[PDB]
Design a protein around this ligand. Structure first.
Ligand code: NAG
Ligand code: NAG
Lengths: 53, 439
């Protein structure tokens, strides 16, 4: 058995998404584009942090 | 009656088509795609797992010289050392204080755990395809399932369906793949019989039940320490353990076009590429004659609201006068506007209501209800929400779709400039003709 993570806070803007994360222990974040070019990215998160995409 | 249509490869969006047969009332069908699956053909090459080392007890011979013979076991080694003087818990082992020797040997085998923890290498070939559909037929939902090529036919309620072939041959798998407990990787594994001492493929076998094992690890025996009985050695560590700690991201998280991956059996689902043609054969008893269907004689249209969002943001009201009670179909005559409703019930003198969605800034379109047509027009506003969680239900725009006020301004500027050229040219023609005639 493995645990599951807490919900983040999401706000909206013109062609962008802003997220605020609340980690308790190291967690992995990843995203990709759908379509012809995936543009993969990967990052480990160990403390409170804010990101824009 | 045979009918042919083309449907784009998008999941979760309904589409409609019109069937028109002379002498009969028109009919409208609705179709929606639920899943598409690809499945390749696979062949096994070899498997890998962890290894074990076997060391039997040393042989100590005092006041003499020993020797060893060759054997056929994998990675076999023997060596003889001189000048040894071993001890035990009660005192020295042998009486002689010189001319003693020691013999040591070892070889490599396959671990017992290979029946549970292993990885397998495959070679892939051309894949097949399958699809499943939902069709709205005479007021009921029916489901069909078939292969996505022209070599299969199915019959449901006396209707025959044939689907495929697909427009594209794109696949997310290469020639060489590797599978381990639900993950698929693209990797160029080394040839059989050509392994490496510290990378993937040091131990190779053809099947978990086989007895032949190939090994290419390094094994060198070293000198024992003074006063001790033991068999020391040097060897490169296992390569299978190293791969597990640094294998990286799987194919599911990196593949393009939004495909999903499953492994038992290996499949890829919901890749949005290409389009799929469809053919349907409708029997004669399903049609209704034009003389039995009701007739509608007078119409008018009004549009109280429009917002060109990604959802159904329109409403329309149409007035009609009907000759008798019955059923009727509704279908749009333009490509940029889509109408949700499929049919209506008409009686007496009343009105009906519909909904539509479009991307146009200024909306003009025609609506057909039981062989007559009406003209509608209205103006539309933009929305306020920036981001949503579902795809659009309308098609894209071209260069010809421009607001009516914008087109008016283009006409005045272009026309005005052109007149100045027109008047200037007439003066030139006259002057040359006069000069020609005077001479
Ligand atoms: C379950 O165990 C059997 C042998 O005991 C093995 O063949 C199989 O791969 C195992 N499955 C998983 C998911 O570990
Ligand atoms: C089944 O048909 C009804 C109309 O009678 C329709 O509203 C419904 O969406 C259909 N089922 C599905 C799963 O679409």
């Amino acid at each position: 058995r493995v645990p599951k993570a807490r919900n983040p806070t999401v706000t909206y803007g013109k062609n962008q998404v802003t997220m605020l994360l609340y980690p308790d222990h190291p967690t992995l974040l990843s995203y990709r584009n759908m379509g012809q070019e995936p543009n993969y990215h990967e990052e480990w998160v160990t403390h409170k942090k804010e990101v824009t995409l | 009656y045979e009918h042919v249509t083309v449907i784009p490869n998008t999941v979760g969006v309904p589409y409609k088509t019109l069937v028109n047969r002379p002498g009969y009332s028109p009919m409208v069908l609705e179709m929606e795609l639920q899943s598409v699956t690809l499945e390749p053909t696979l062949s096994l090459d070899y498997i890998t797992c962890e290894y074990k080392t076997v060391i039997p007890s040393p042989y100590v011979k005092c006041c003499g010289t020993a020797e060893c013979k060759d054997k056929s076991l994998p990675d076999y080694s023997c060596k003889v050392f001189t000048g040894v003087y071993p001890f035990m818990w009660g005192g020295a082992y042998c009486f002689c204080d010189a001319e003693n020797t020691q013999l040591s040997e070892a070889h490599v085998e396959k671990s017992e755990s290979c029946k549970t923890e292993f990885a397998s290498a495959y070679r892939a070939h051309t894949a097949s395809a399958s699809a499943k559909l939902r069709v709205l037929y005479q007021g009921n939902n029916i489901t069909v399932a078939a292969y996505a090529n022209g070599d299969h036919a199915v019959t449901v309620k006396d209707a025959k369906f044939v689907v495929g072939p697909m427009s594209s041959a794109w696949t997310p798998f290469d020639n060489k793949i590797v599978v381990y407990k639900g993950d698929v990787y693209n990797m160029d594994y080394p040839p059989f019989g050509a392994g490496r001492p510290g990378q993937f493929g040091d131990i190779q076998s053809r099947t978990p039940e086989s007895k032949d094992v190939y090994a290419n690890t390094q094994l060198v025996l070293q000198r024992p320490a003074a006063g001790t009985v033991h068999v020391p050695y040097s060897q490169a560590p296992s390569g299978f353990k190293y791969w597990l700690k640094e294998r990286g991201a799987s194919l599911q998280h990196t593949a393009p076009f939004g495909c999903q991956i499953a492994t038992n059996p290996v499949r890829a689902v919901n890749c949005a590429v290409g389009n799929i043609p469809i053919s349907i054969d409708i029997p004669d008893a399903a049609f209704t004659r034009v003389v039995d269907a009701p007739s509608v004689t007078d119409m008018s249209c009004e549009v109280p609201a429009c917002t060109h969002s990604s959802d159904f943001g329109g409403v329309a009201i149409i007035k009609y006068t009907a000759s008798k009670k019955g059923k009727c179909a509704v279908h749009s005559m333009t490509n940029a506007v889509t109408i949700r409703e499929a049919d209506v019930e008409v009686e007496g003198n009343s009105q009906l209501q519909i909904s539509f969605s479009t991307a146009l800034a200024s909306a003009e379109f025609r609506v057909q209800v039981c062989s007559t047509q009406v003209h509608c027009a209205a103006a539309c506003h933009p929305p306020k929400d920036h981001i949503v969680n579902y795809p659009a239900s309308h098609t894209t725009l071209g260069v010809q779709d421009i607001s009516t006020t914008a087109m008016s301004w283009v006409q005045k500027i272009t026309g005005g400039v052109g007149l100045i050229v027109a008047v200037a040219a007439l003066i030139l023609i006259v002057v040359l003709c006069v000069s020609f005639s005077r001479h």
